[PDB]
């Protein structure tokens with residue numbers, strides 16, 4: 218694989234979004250991966266609706282603003298036959314009744330792929346597929362306060378994760394990093410991005426539950 222990748226320079230990635238006061242990280246991670254795969258398939262980047270996922274993917278196992286899984290969101294898109302654009306179905310930061318309208322569906326998938334639990338496997342996926350949804354342990358104030366540089370937290374878990382984000386690339390100086398898009402707005406971190414420690418024993422569990430949709 219290449220020494221470095223940045224899918225933003227290829228047109229795969231929308232600007233940084235803000236989930237606000239709603240536990241919807243999973244939905245932003247999912248739309249980020251689906252934005253990237255839709256662009257791979259069609260050559261058109263269209264911002265996708267997280268609210269659609271929050272309101273409507275309960276049947277697949279998601280819990281709205283209380284949390285959920287990117288894989289459940291990918292399954293919903295399959296089961297549902299589509300997903301509405303961000304423009305058609307704007308973000309409210311609160312759970313509401315489902316208002317999906319197929320007329321405004323701009324994305325679809327035929328399931329998802331769970332990458333095996335190796336950073337080598339995740340690197341190959343990022344290099345070949347596009348942006349990848351990942352689970353990480355973000356339950357440390359060092360993550361909340363992150364501003365710049367390569368993020369390394371001594372107390373991070375490789376096994377227990379609590380935040381879904383999106384890997385959009387990786388790069389180098391040891392001190393290799395994953396280039397991660399977060400959903401906390403552009404004021405957090407490096408314009409809303411964070412560089413996470415790469416090839417340091419699966420730091421923060423970033424290769425523990427990586428996935429993307431089948432498109």
Ligand SMILES: *C(=N)C1(NC(=O)[C@@H]2C[C@@H](S(=O)(=O)c3ccccc3Cl)CN2C(=O)C2(c3ccc(Cl)cc3)CC2)CC1
Pocket residue numbers: 239240241242243278279280282283284285286287288351352353378379380381382426
């Ligand atoms: C987002 N604002 C919050 N975090 C979550 O919803 C996270 C997202 C995923 S995860 O990426 O942590 C993960 C963890 C383990 C295995 C796979 C994945 Cl994708 C799940 N989140 C959770 O907080 C948990 C969860 C799991 C399943 C459901 Cl339906 C709800 C919640 C607790 C694991 C809300 C802060």
